Amino acid sequence: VLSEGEWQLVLHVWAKVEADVAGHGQDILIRLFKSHPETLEKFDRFKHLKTEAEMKASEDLKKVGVTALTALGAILKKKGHHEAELKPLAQSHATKHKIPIKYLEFISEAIIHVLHSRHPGDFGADAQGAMNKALELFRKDIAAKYKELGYQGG
């Protein structure tokens, strides 16, 4: 799917994320919630967080962000050979929480935005394209695992 060069650009910027998984996770979630507020409804433990400062102060939100970016990091490092990592995540998202593919599109946008905000010198056009392809492949494979479980992802 992705070229070896595209994967290298993906994993190069991901190494920058790993310098501060918590801070990236916070900014991505807060960007997702501000750009698409309906996504905040999937997090009942976050309903009382009304301001950006309250979200940044919530260790719970921070930990949830770290858990997400950790799983995505492990998937990206498989360079497309991620069935074993993607199936449990698809099941969690399709049976417990029911997350539509469109919401995975929303957070992908927030991921790209935060990465370019923090690392423009390591996230120009070729790298953005590479990361977009990797996230597209993630969403496409999650969608197929969704259907396999009987959840159509809408």
Ligand code: HEM
């Ligand atoms: C790249 C995108 C995402 C990744 C990698 C991801 C990953 C994860 C992981 C690893 C868990 C923990 C599951 C477990 O231990 O069984 C989780 C939980 C969850 N995810 Fe996602 N997720 C993503 C996107 C989203 C989006 C966009 C939403 C909602 C808008 C969402 C909602 C949830 C919820 C509600 C939970 C359960 C956490 C809790 O309620 O305490 N996720 N996610």
